[PDB]
């Protein structure tokens, strides 16, 4: 019985799309991962235990002799002493702080935990923050809304088996986030030739012209979408839609209007 590294996964201000994205991994599948690779010791979406029993499972993991790695999904709502976001009667900011204190490493899955995300968008009624900002601690960021499971699992496996991957200025591993979406887009030749769709109904759109005039943020977005695809089959520009810039910090405010470049 080889010991499997303990992973604690917290849900804060999230939509669950990151947990969903994670379970779409096929290298390995999620069953192989939690049966052979890691010991996933707290995960609200799928754990058997509930209530006090779940809280005790969390505390057992946090007190584990072998330590643990922390995965955080979602931003942290900080207005009113953090009371607008609570689990087991405790502000999410308090519990995340406690769990971060002794973590071997923190992986922020998704743009929300990395940078604050959707609830941080103006006027930010819950005064939500990304984890690094709220806790003042260093995070490995795996952003996108949600990130590809390839990026999340690859980072988890890299951290357990080698160490911290090389990160860019926004804390994203360069293994996945080193290249612009646009530099790998199959419609680049159209961009270069100034062959743009003026609308989604146009013959240009039907011919698969570049989506830049329709708001495509691929030229300012670092992600590996066109290279690795999603779900082994597709990606947004291949489905004829512009990139929203969803792996960029604060994209809700910097990349909008999504259908414009202004």
């Amino acid at each position: 019985a080889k010991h499997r590294p303990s992973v604690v996964w917290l849900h804060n201000a999230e939509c669950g799309g990151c947990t969903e994205a994670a379970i779409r991994t096929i290298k390995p599948y999620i069953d192989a991962l939690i049966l052979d690779t890691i010991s996933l010791d707290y995960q609200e979406t799928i754990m058997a235990a509930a209530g006090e029993a779940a809280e005790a499972a969390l505390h057992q993991a946090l007190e584990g002799k072998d330590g643990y790695y922390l995965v955080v999904e979602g931003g942290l709502p900080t207005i009113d002493g953090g009371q607008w976001g609570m689990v087991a009667g405790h502000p999410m900011i308090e519990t995340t702080k406690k769990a971060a204190a002794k973590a071997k490493g923190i992986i922020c899955i998704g743009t929300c935990s990395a940078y604050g995300g959707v609830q941080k968008a103006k006027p930010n009624p819950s005064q939500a923050k990304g984890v690094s900002e709220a806790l003042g601690v260093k995070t490995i960021n795996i952003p996108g809304c949600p990130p590809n499971p390839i990026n999340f699992v690859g980072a988890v496996v890299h951290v357990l088996t080698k160490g911290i991957p090389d990160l860019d200025e926004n804390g994203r591993p360069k293994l996945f986030y080193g290249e612009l979406v646009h530099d790998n887009c199959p419609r680049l030749p159209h961009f270069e030739a100034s062959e743009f769709a003026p609308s989604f109904d146009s013959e240009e759109a039907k011919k698969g012209f570049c989506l830049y005039e329709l708001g495509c943020k691929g030229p300012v977005t670092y992600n590996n979408c066109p290279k690795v695809l999603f779900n082994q089959v597709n990606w947004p520009v291949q489905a004829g839609h512009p990139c929203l810039g969803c792996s960029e910090p604060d994209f809700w405010d910097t990349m909008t209007p999504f259908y414009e470049q202004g």
Partner: protein, 544 residues
Amino acid sequence: PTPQSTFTGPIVVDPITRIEGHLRIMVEVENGKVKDAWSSSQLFRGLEIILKGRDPRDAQHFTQRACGVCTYVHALASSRCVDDAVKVSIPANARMMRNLVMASQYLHDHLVHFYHLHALDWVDVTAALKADPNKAAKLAASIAPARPGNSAKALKAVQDKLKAFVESGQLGIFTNAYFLGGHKAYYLPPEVDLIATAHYLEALHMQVKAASAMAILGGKNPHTQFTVVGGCSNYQGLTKDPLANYLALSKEVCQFVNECYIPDLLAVAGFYKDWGGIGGTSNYLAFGEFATDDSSPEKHLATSQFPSGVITGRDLGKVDNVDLGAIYEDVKYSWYAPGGDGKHPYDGVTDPKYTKLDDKDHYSWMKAPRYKGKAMEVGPLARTFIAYAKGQPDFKKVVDMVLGKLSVPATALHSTLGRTAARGIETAIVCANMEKWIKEMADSGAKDNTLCAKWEMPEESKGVGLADAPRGALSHWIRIKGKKIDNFQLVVPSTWNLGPRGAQGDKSPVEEALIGTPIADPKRPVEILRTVHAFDPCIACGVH
């Protein structure tokens, strides 16, 4: 007999796990039965506030982030909404593509809910270690269709993996499970636990295929990106080779629904037949889904192949039409400012005001949606009753089937067991329809590949987008002023189901369903979870 303790006193379960989002459940218990209940949503994000003043075209991208479990459905609702506000009629191909993506979402979402969210309330995974895999194989061979995954050898490998995992001492997501050590409320034979655990693992793989199928049309999953005002952007979604692969994947998923999901669900139902008497409510609402004419919200309501309607007081003889003018939301018992009660969603107000934990006067971040003063249950059960009542041929066939298999009357469906069975029933029906719907779109797409219509942004307008998402009646409501979002309101299926009391002090569906719940063991109150989970709760959705 149904196990029940003598416990008198409060029970709080927070967090409710195996749902999306953050839910606290408080109950008062007397002689081992729930006598009062509160459904307390514990996170606010405030998408409605965030949308104010933004581009109506942006709405769907924000609102899709209401939730990633029921991914897509909010982008769809927002697109239908803005489509209605600009008065654009989407092309035939866009209607078909949008409805096919919804269908794919039903299959993914329901499969994952039954196995990965709900099953652990009924299946004692550790008891599966006690089964003889040979006896388990014969059992499965006798009830369900024949399949290699149900052989002695496949079931033994599953049992071998589980045993090595349990003996490692790192139980992971099973740590402190309510079934550890046995539990009076868990009735399944060990062989059945093994079979269901095998399929639980299988389903982890099959849900990947269901999401791949969806992504062929949707761009990616989670969070699709193929819908635009006026229709869809995905021209490749209409061509032959992708639709052939879409079909092929949906067929694999549907084989698994028919070989594993439905047979497991029926086995569980057979053993927990007493749960046909627990967790019933009386009123049902649906906006319908899978319309042949989505030119307007009126037409969606009228032509939804899974029909729309309102049943009141369990009266299956009187399905009324949906009056969209009669929907409103109260906040009396919610964490919002005073004076926000009785608001139609076009006049919706979202002014957060927190008080404190377990304040019986204000205890949820969900608003309380009401229909003419009545709470409404939404979701698979609501759709199933409405479809059955109206004589929808597929729903009449599969329902009467399920009822005959189980030897229970149609009245047993007003229950937690009913609610659970309804979810399977409609999955089987979506599956039976997939090939016809795919063929329709393939044929249409080859003849003419129009996918988006032209449209103009009006200075001032309003619109509504309706869908029946996997959890029920979803509506997005926009007021446009100066070509911008003046007001944008979501009223979500889990808001209908799991909101708090309305302004008259009246329990929401989940709160009412909880009354009369037996508690065999107040330390491990799995019965609360069986009823809550059967609603397929989503607090991210409910509160937004």
